[PDB]
Amino acid sequence: SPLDQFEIRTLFGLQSSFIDLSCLNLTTFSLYTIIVLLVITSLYTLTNNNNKIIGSRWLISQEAIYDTIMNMTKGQIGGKNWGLYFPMIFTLFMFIFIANLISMIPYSFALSAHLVFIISLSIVIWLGNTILGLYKHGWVFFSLFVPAGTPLPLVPLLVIIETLSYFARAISLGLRLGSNILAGHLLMVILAGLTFNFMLINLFTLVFGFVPLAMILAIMMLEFAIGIIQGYVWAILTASYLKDAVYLH
Amino acid sequence: MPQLVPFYFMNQLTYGFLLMITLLILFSQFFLPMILRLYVSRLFISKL
Amino acid sequence: QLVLAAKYIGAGISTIGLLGAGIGIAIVFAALINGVSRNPSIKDTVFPMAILGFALSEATGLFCLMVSFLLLFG
Amino acid sequence: MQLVLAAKYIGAGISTIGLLGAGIGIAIVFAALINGVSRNPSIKDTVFPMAILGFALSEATGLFCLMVSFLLLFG
Amino acid sequence: MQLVLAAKYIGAGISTIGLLGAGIGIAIVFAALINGVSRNPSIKDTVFPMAILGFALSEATGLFCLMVSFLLLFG
Amino acid sequence: QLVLAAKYIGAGISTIGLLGAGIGIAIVFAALINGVSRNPSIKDTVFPMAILGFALSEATGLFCLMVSFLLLFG
Amino acid sequence: MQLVLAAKYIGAGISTIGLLGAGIGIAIVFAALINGVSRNPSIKDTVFPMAILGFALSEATGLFCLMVSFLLLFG
Amino acid sequence: MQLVLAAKYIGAGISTIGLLGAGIGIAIVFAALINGVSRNPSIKDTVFPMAILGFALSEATGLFCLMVSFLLL
Amino acid sequence: MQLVLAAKYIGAGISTIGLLGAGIGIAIVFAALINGVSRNPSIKDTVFPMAILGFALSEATGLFCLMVSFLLLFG
Amino acid sequence: MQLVLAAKYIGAGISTIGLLGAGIGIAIVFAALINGVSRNPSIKDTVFPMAILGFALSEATGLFCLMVSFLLLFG
Amino acid sequence: MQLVLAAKYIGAGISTIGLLGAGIGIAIVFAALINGVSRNPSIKDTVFPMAILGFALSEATGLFCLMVSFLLLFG
Amino acid sequence: QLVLAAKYIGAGISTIGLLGAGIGIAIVFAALINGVSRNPSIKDTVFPMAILGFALSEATGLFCLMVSFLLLFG
Amino acid sequence: MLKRFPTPILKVYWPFFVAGAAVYYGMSKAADLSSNTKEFINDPRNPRFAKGGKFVEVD
Amino acid sequence: LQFALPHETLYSEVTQVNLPAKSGRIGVLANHVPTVEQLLPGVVEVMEGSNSKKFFISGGFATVQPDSQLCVTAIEAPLESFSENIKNLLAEAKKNVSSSREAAEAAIQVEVLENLQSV
Amino acid sequence: YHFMGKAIPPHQLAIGTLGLLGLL
């Protein structure tokens, strides 16, 4: 069982017999959400030395993240009011960016590799695009489903397999991230499990047994890239989707 | 897969959405404008 | 229950059609990159055509995934 | 009829292999569309309905393939 | 018998794999059509029937793929 | 009665080779369209060899079709 | 009971072929990125978000196939 | 022999996959032929024997798969 | 349990095929790298990290298909 | 014995799939030959033995599959 | 047990299909090297180390396939 | 015996990878032809790289060939 | 420390919150439907056992 | 008709022209694609059935026309019946100047010179 | 902005196809 690293264990506990209060209780998932919140709080509270203008070396990091997500959501929705949807496009980044660096620490735990939470967050953003689009643009919201000047005898086909791609968008956006984080962690644990039993046979294998160690180091080098790039790709697709929902093509 | 289908669905989703609303209110009202105060201050000293 | 085991083979074989979808999205964005790099003032003109072609190609890769879900869950 | 009912699902799985050709085909059509509009910006209104024409005409093969898949799965 | 009635459905599931040939072929034809029209606009009236001619028998090869599936699916 | 089953299976298998002809007709007419659109005056010179290769590449997939028809009854 | 787990593992093996449709995908995207940067050195900061977008938004279709493989293996 | 006669027909079905190589390759040959003749018309009677040679050899490679499939019948 | 362990070996055999995606993939990236250096030898220190990045991101899709084989051999 | 001969015939059928590599490859060689003569007319006597060499080597790499199938049929 | 062992031989047979990726890929790298020297000959000494690097990294994904093949032979 | 029959099946399977060499050797020789035709003066420099590429792709095919022979005999 | 600025976060983001409540409710019913399956009816940490009922255990 | 130096204009019907283009050598023919290319500092040649006559050149432009006429323009230009020690002694002074805006011009000489050596 | 049978130009046409496939 190489997948035991994702087990959810209850720690602080709470129960009753009147009402099902077992929904909220401090758990491994919940404790790592508390840790994510305290890290994100720590990146801005004690980072700023006594509210100085000059912005010490720690604040350049949270300066660059801010600027690379402003200049990304200005180039996507880019209309009359792009900044009204900027806090959500930033707080969808920082959760995924911090929750995929915390998960790299060896005896730790991936928030992002729970499909039930990430798929739920994706369905929340998809319904919050459809409701916002219907509210802002009435019955002509469905004009999104015809591409451009197209010949009329093939328009209903191009409507059906446009709407099918419109509600595949509900689960695709989440399952991309879930699949990347889950496959990366499962790859690292399985190769560690193979190189461990590689190094317990006869003593000639601990000699020149440095090359599988170097391969695992190279995969860990790759895994930060595949963890930060997904945190960026989430925040670019849910900027493009707000471009479609707010502005009709 | 066995590990991502327990009874803990409402646990996961409850603390997750509490953290999302928390970070949303928290970022938007606190931490983004404390960077933007730095921006407007730097530009105000620059324009003088 | 031979059928309960043979639906899993069908759900495995019916997932091969995404091979075309990945290569397809690649060829679309490859042509988009070449078109922007040759003509720098065409991005805002031709980019919705790229997003359209991606949406169509994924949906026509997605047919295989929904057939796999019908075989695995229905 | 367990053997035939299993062969229904096996044939429905093997049916959609050829459906990847439509996924490549829509892409090649729109790839030449972007590549052609990139040279001439003023040829859009002629070429783009021709592009959606080629889109649907290449789409018909994958739709027939998915149709044979649904015929094997539902009868 | 069930042993050949299974094989009918499995062979029909096999025979739709050749449809990817037509699904990519219509794309290459209309891709070169789009490249030619975007390269030279005024040659369209001569070029377009050749593309329709290529599409016709490429889609006919797709129907040649599909007709063996129809033949083996119903006897 | 199992030769009647595997016979129809292999006759189904023999249709896969038609994709070569289905792509080949397209490469031939693609070169035709490229040559006509690049050089308009060479149409009558270029055309008959293109029709020749078109018919021959059709015959290549028709080999797959005739092996299929030979398997179906015989 | 052995047949269910046996065909389960066979189908999970079959459902990883679709990653060759993602390796070539990431290849063609970064290949066009290289050829686009090399022939125009001032387009990198405009073409790089489209590169990352096309990269992950093309892998996703291989990761769907890997999730079908995981639901077979462990579910 | 029932299973053996079944396997003969299965293998004869398998053996026809290799014809797609010739079915694509004749097109690549004649495509470069058409592109070269349309690029320069005067070199046509020089180039066209190489095209006939390429068609002959590619059709021979298809004929190998065809005769293997015939040996199973 | 002989049948399921025989199916494990076949599944590990099938999950080897997806490496051809990476095998063509790394090559298409480095082929574009060579054809980009030959058009412009001044853009080397700009282009070559993107080639290494595409190498890594396609090798990840190769290893995602290798790990399923390592599960089906032992785990 | 009967099951063994059946499998020899199945493998002899499988083994000739690799001939399509030679069938496509001889064509890429002769197609580049045609494009080279049409690009440069004077280089025909220089280039042509390389094309003959490429035909011979690629035909041998195809013929490896044919002789393996010959070994499966007879040896 | 013969039923497990025979399937292990079959999986070892199946596994080696993925090496065609490396076989095409190494050659794509060297072909781009050839087409790159022919445009600019003064860059051969710079480019050729990355060509042999691409040879090594594309041989890597073929030898992983070959590794799984031998692990389904002698283990 | 089933194992000897599975040996011949797997030996039949493992020769599919030879098409990789059969296509790739041709891509190398095609770039060789298109390089000599574009620049005839670089032929003696370029030709050993083509020989080397032929040898390495031949080795990649010969790995599949020797796995086929090991499934045959050893 | 930090000066709170009253940014509009309710007259902008209401459909996100409505969707959040809807997905919350739908996942509640999905969890209740999944917690009574054959595989998970004898896992002792489900909240059935903390209130009343015990051990259907007929499968 | 169409192949001109500013001081001396040269050619008039042609069966094959070889040119040293911007990206590698090329060969125009009886019917060819309409193209413009910078002409690099290198050898050229005319044809009239089976007639070999090669010139050197400074560089300039080639332009294949839709009407099919090829126009080739360069500055200075018979083959070895034109340009050894004349080259050698100059090559010396060339390389010397490079080690010196002024020495940048000598860079241009090394490539132009090195090329001519091959003839 | 289509024109079906020289009638009033229809709005976007998208709702009617969804309504047709809804009642099935």
PDB file of N, CA, C and O in Angstrom, chain I residues 7-47:
ATOM      1  N   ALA I   7      -2.418 -11.807 -14.425  1.00  0.00           N
ATOM      2  CA  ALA I   7      -2.964 -10.590 -15.010  1.00  0.00           C
ATOM      3  C   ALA I   7      -2.121  -9.379 -14.641  1.00  0.00           C
ATOM      4  O   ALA I   7      -2.059  -8.415 -15.407  1.00  0.00           O
ATOM      5  N   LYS I   8      -1.495  -9.412 -13.465  1.00  0.00           N
ATOM      6  CA  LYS I   8      -0.568  -8.362 -13.053  1.00  0.00           C
ATOM      7  C   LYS I   8       0.587  -8.201 -14.032  1.00  0.00           C
ATOM      8  O   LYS I   8       0.965  -7.074 -14.372  1.00  0.00           O
ATOM      9  N   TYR I   9       1.124  -9.321 -14.519  1.00  0.00           N
ATOM     10  CA  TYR I   9       2.260  -9.270 -15.433  1.00  0.00           C
ATOM     11  C   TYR I   9       1.847  -8.719 -16.792  1.00  0.00           C
ATOM     12  O   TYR I   9       2.572  -7.919 -17.396  1.00  0.00           O
ATOM     13  N   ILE I  10       0.669  -9.120 -17.273  1.00  0.00           N
ATOM     14  CA  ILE I  10       0.151  -8.598 -18.534  1.00  0.00           C
ATOM     15  C   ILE I  10      -0.147  -7.111 -18.414  1.00  0.00           C
ATOM     16  O   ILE I  10       0.127  -6.337 -19.337  1.00  0.00           O
ATOM     17  N   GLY I  11      -0.674  -6.682 -17.265  1.00  0.00           N
ATOM     18  CA  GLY I  11      -0.955  -5.269 -17.073  1.00  0.00           C
ATOM     19  C   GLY I  11       0.306  -4.432 -17.014  1.00  0.00           C
ATOM     20  O   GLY I  11       0.354  -3.320 -17.547  1.00  0.00           O
ATOM     21  N   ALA I  12       1.355  -4.968 -16.387  1.00  0.00           N
ATOM     22  CA  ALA I  12       2.639  -4.275 -16.389  1.00  0.00           C
ATOM     23  C   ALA I  12       3.247  -4.258 -17.782  1.00  0.00           C
ATOM     24  O   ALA I  12       4.002  -3.342 -18.127  1.00  0.00           O
ATOM     25  N   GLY I  13       2.937  -5.269 -18.594  1.00  0.00           N
ATOM     26  CA  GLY I  13       3.359  -5.236 -19.982  1.00  0.00           C
ATOM     27  C   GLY I  13       2.648  -4.162 -20.786  1.00  0.00           C
ATOM     28  O   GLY I  13       3.272  -3.464 -21.587  1.00  0.00           O
ATOM     29  N   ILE I  14       1.335  -4.026 -20.586  1.00  0.00           N
ATOM     30  CA  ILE I  14       0.556  -3.029 -21.321  1.00  0.00           C
ATOM     31  C   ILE I  14       0.947  -1.624 -20.881  1.00  0.00           C
ATOM     32  O   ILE I  14       1.044  -0.701 -21.700  1.00  0.00           O
ATOM     33  N   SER I  15       1.253  -1.448 -19.609  1.00  0.00           N
ATOM     34  CA  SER I  15       1.600  -0.101 -19.154  1.00  0.00           C
ATOM     35  C   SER I  15       3.035   0.323 -19.508  1.00  0.00           C
ATOM     36  O   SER I  15       3.549   1.265 -18.913  1.00  0.00           O
ATOM     37  N   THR I  16       3.692  -0.358 -20.441  1.00  0.00           N
ATOM     38  CA  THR I  16       4.993   0.039 -20.941  1.00  0.00           C
ATOM     39  C   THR I  16       4.869   0.886 -22.199  1.00  0.00           C
ATOM     40  O   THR I  16       5.765   1.687 -22.495  1.00  0.00           O
ATOM     41  N   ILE I  17       3.738   0.753 -22.907  1.00  0.00           N
ATOM     42  CA  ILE I  17       3.546   1.348 -24.233  1.00  0.00           C
ATOM     43  C   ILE I  17       3.586   2.869 -24.174  1.00  0.00           C
ATOM     44  O   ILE I  17       4.151   3.524 -25.060  1.00  0.00           O
ATOM     45  N   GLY I  18       3.099   3.451 -23.078  1.00  0.00           N
ATOM     46  CA  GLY I  18       3.048   4.899 -22.930  1.00  0.00           C
ATOM     47  C   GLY I  18       4.397   5.598 -22.861  1.00  0.00           C
ATOM     48  O   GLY I  18       4.430   6.834 -22.875  1.00  0.00           O
ATOM     49  N   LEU I  19       5.501   4.854 -22.799  1.00  0.00           N
ATOM     50  CA  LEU I  19       6.817   5.478 -22.804  1.00  0.00           C
ATOM     51  C   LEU I  19       7.216   5.971 -24.189  1.00  0.00           C
ATOM     52  O   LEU I  19       8.129   6.801 -24.305  1.00  0.00           O
ATOM     53  N   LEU I  20       6.557   5.480 -25.247  1.00  0.00           N
ATOM     54  CA  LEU I  20       6.912   5.918 -26.593  1.00  0.00           C
ATOM     55  C   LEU I  20       6.534   7.371 -26.809  1.00  0.00           C
ATOM     56  O   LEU I  20       7.154   8.056 -27.628  1.00  0.00           O
ATOM     57  N   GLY I  21       5.524   7.847 -26.085  1.00  0.00           N
ATOM     58  CA  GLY I  21       5.164   9.246 -26.060  1.00  0.00           C
ATOM     59  C   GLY I  21       6.315  10.109 -25.606  1.00  0.00           C
ATOM     60  O   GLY I  21       6.667  11.072 -26.284  1.00  0.00           O
ATOM     61  N   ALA I  22       6.951   9.738 -24.494  1.00  0.00           N
ATOM     62  CA  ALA I  22       8.121  10.480 -24.036  1.00  0.00           C
ATOM     63  C   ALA I  22       9.303  10.299 -24.975  1.00  0.00           C
ATOM     64  O   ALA I  22      10.078  11.243 -25.180  1.00  0.00           O
ATOM     65  N   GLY I  23       9.440   9.108 -25.564  1.00  0.00           N
ATOM     66  CA  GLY I  23      10.571   8.845 -26.444  1.00  0.00           C
ATOM     67  C   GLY I  23      10.534   9.670 -27.716  1.00  0.00           C
ATOM     68  O   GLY I  23      11.571  10.102 -28.221  1.00  0.00           O
ATOM     69  N   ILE I  24       9.337   9.900 -28.249  1.00  0.00           N
ATOM     70  CA  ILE I  24       9.220  10.833 -29.359  1.00  0.00           C
ATOM     71  C   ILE I  24       9.255  12.263 -28.835  1.00  0.00           C
ATOM     72  O   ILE I  24       9.764  13.173 -29.503  1.00  0.00           O
ATOM     73  N   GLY I  25       8.788  12.472 -27.608  1.00  0.00           N
ATOM     74  CA  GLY I  25       8.588  13.797 -27.076  1.00  0.00           C
ATOM     75  C   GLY I  25       9.812  14.628 -26.778  1.00  0.00           C
ATOM     76  O   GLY I  25       9.919  15.796 -27.193  1.00  0.00           O
ATOM     77  N   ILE I  26      10.738  14.006 -26.041  1.00  0.00           N
ATOM     78  CA  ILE I  26      12.012  14.639 -25.704  1.00  0.00           C
ATOM     79  C   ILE I  26      12.757  14.992 -26.976  1.00  0.00           C
ATOM     80  O   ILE I  26      13.387  16.053 -27.094  1.00  0.00           O
ATOM     81  N   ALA I  27      12.626  14.127 -27.967  1.00  0.00           N
ATOM     82  CA  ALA I  27      13.262  14.324 -29.250  1.00  0.00           C
ATOM     83  C   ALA I  27      12.672  15.487 -30.016  1.00  0.00           C
ATOM     84  O   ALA I  27      13.410  16.221 -30.669  1.00  0.00           O
ATOM     85  N   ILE I  28      11.344  15.636 -30.006  1.00  0.00           N
ATOM     86  CA  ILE I  28      10.741  16.764 -30.716  1.00  0.00           C
ATOM     87  C   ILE I  28      11.154  18.076 -30.066  1.00  0.00           C
ATOM     88  O   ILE I  28      11.462  19.060 -30.759  1.00  0.00           O
ATOM     89  N   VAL I  29      11.267  18.078 -28.732  1.00  0.00           N
ATOM     90  CA  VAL I  29      11.735  19.272 -28.026  1.00  0.00           C
ATOM     91  C   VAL I  29      13.177  19.607 -28.400  1.00  0.00           C
ATOM     92  O   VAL I  29      13.493  20.750 -28.757  1.00  0.00           O
ATOM     93  N   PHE I  30      14.064  18.611 -28.383  1.00  0.00           N
ATOM     94  CA  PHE I  30      15.463  18.897 -28.687  1.00  0.00           C
ATOM     95  C   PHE I  30      15.696  19.139 -30.172  1.00  0.00           C
ATOM     96  O   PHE I  30      16.621  19.874 -30.540  1.00  0.00           O
ATOM     97  N   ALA I  31      14.852  18.573 -31.031  1.00  0.00           N
ATOM     98  CA  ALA I  31      14.926  18.860 -32.456  1.00  0.00           C
ATOM     99  C   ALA I  31      14.547  20.303 -32.732  1.00  0.00           C
ATOM    100  O   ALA I  31      15.192  20.980 -33.547  1.00  0.00           O
ATOM    101  N   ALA I  32      13.521  20.799 -32.040  1.00  0.00           N
ATOM    102  CA  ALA I  32      13.180  22.207 -32.159  1.00  0.00           C
ATOM    103  C   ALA I  32      14.265  23.088 -31.569  1.00  0.00           C
ATOM    104  O   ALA I  32      14.516  24.186 -32.076  1.00  0.00           O
ATOM    105  N   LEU I  33      14.934  22.615 -30.514  1.00  0.00           N
ATOM    106  CA  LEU I  33      16.060  23.354 -29.944  1.00  0.00           C
ATOM    107  C   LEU I  33      17.195  23.511 -30.949  1.00  0.00           C
ATOM    108  O   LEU I  33      17.749  24.604 -31.107  1.00  0.00           O
ATOM    109  N   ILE I  34      17.536  22.428 -31.647  1.00  0.00           N
ATOM    110  CA  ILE I  34      18.602  22.473 -32.646  1.00  0.00           C
ATOM    111  C   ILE I  34      18.214  23.380 -33.809  1.00  0.00           C
ATOM    112  O   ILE I  34      18.992  24.249 -34.232  1.00  0.00           O
ATOM    113  N   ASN I  35      16.990  23.222 -34.316  1.00  0.00           N
ATOM    114  CA  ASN I  35      16.526  24.063 -35.412  1.00  0.00           C
ATOM    115  C   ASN I  35      16.282  25.507 -34.999  1.00  0.00           C
ATOM    116  O   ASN I  35      16.115  26.358 -35.877  1.00  0.00           O
ATOM    117  N   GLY I  36      16.242  25.804 -33.705  1.00  0.00           N
ATOM    118  CA  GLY I  36      16.153  27.176 -33.260  1.00  0.00           C
ATOM    119  C   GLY I  36      17.512  27.799 -33.031  1.00  0.00           C
ATOM    120  O   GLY I  36      17.678  29.011 -33.198  1.00  0.00           O
ATOM    121  N   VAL I  37      18.492  26.986 -32.632  1.00  0.00           N
ATOM    122  CA  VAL I  37      19.851  27.501 -32.503  1.00  0.00           C
ATOM    123  C   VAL I  37      20.447  27.760 -33.881  1.00  0.00           C
ATOM    124  O   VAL I  37      21.178  28.740 -34.079  1.00  0.00           O
ATOM    125  N   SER I  38      20.095  26.936 -34.870  1.00  0.00           N
ATOM    126  CA  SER I  38      20.675  27.108 -36.199  1.00  0.00           C
ATOM    127  C   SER I  38      20.111  28.331 -36.912  1.00  0.00           C
ATOM    128  O   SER I  38      20.801  28.947 -37.732  1.00  0.00           O
ATOM    129  N   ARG I  39      18.869  28.705 -36.618  1.00  0.00           N
ATOM    130  CA  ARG I  39      18.337  29.939 -37.184  1.00  0.00           C
ATOM    131  C   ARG I  39      18.892  31.164 -36.475  1.00  0.00           C
ATOM    132  O   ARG I  39      19.015  32.227 -37.090  1.00  0.00           O
ATOM    133  N   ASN I  40      19.222  31.043 -35.194  1.00  0.00           N
ATOM    134  CA  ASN I  40      19.689  32.183 -34.419  1.00  0.00           C
ATOM    135  C   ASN I  40      20.578  31.695 -33.283  1.00  0.00           C
ATOM    136  O   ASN I  40      20.069  31.203 -32.267  1.00  0.00           O
ATOM    137  N   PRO I  41      21.902  31.815 -33.408  1.00  0.00           N
ATOM    138  CA  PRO I  41      22.794  31.327 -32.347  1.00  0.00           C
ATOM    139  C   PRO I  41      22.947  32.273 -31.167  1.00  0.00           C
ATOM    140  O   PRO I  41      23.740  31.976 -30.264  1.00  0.00           O
ATOM    141  N   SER I  42      22.228  33.392 -31.140  1.00  0.00           N
ATOM    142  CA  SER I  42      22.363  34.365 -30.063  1.00  0.00           C
ATOM    143  C   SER I  42      21.347  34.178 -28.949  1.00  0.00           C
ATOM    144  O   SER I  42      21.481  34.809 -27.896  1.00  0.00           O
ATOM    145  N   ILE I  43      20.339  33.342 -29.157  1.00  0.00           N
ATOM    146  CA  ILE I  43      19.217  33.215 -28.242  1.00  0.00           C
ATOM    147  C   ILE I  43      19.341  31.934 -27.401  1.00  0.00           C
ATOM    148  O   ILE I  43      18.353  31.419 -26.871  1.00  0.00           O
ATOM    149  N   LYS I  44      20.573  31.445 -27.241  1.00  0.00           N
ATOM    150  CA  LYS I  44      20.830  30.151 -26.616  1.00  0.00           C
ATOM    151  C   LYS I  44      20.448  30.145 -25.143  1.00  0.00           C
ATOM    152  O   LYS I  44      19.714  29.264 -24.679  1.00  0.00           O
ATOM    153  N   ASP I  45      20.930  31.136 -24.394  1.00  0.00           N
ATOM    154  CA  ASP I  45      20.680  31.224 -22.961  1.00  0.00           C
ATOM    155  C   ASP I  45      19.266  31.668 -22.628  1.00  0.00           C
ATOM    156  O   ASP I  45      18.905  31.687 -21.445  1.00  0.00           O
ATOM    157  N   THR I  46      18.470  32.043 -23.622  1.00  0.00           N
ATOM    158  CA  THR I  46      17.044  32.263 -23.446  1.00  0.00           C
ATOM    159  C   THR I  46      16.229  31.017 -23.753  1.00  0.00           C
ATOM    160  O   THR I  46      15.300  30.690 -23.008  1.00  0.00           O
ATOM    161  N   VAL I  47      16.597  30.288 -24.799  1.00  0.00           N
ATOM    162  CA  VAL I  47      15.784  29.178 -25.276  1.00  0.00           C
ATOM    163  C   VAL I  47      16.052  27.894 -24.502  1.00  0.00           C
ATOM    164  O   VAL I  47      15.108  27.183 -24.147  1.00  0.00           O
TER     165      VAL I  47
END
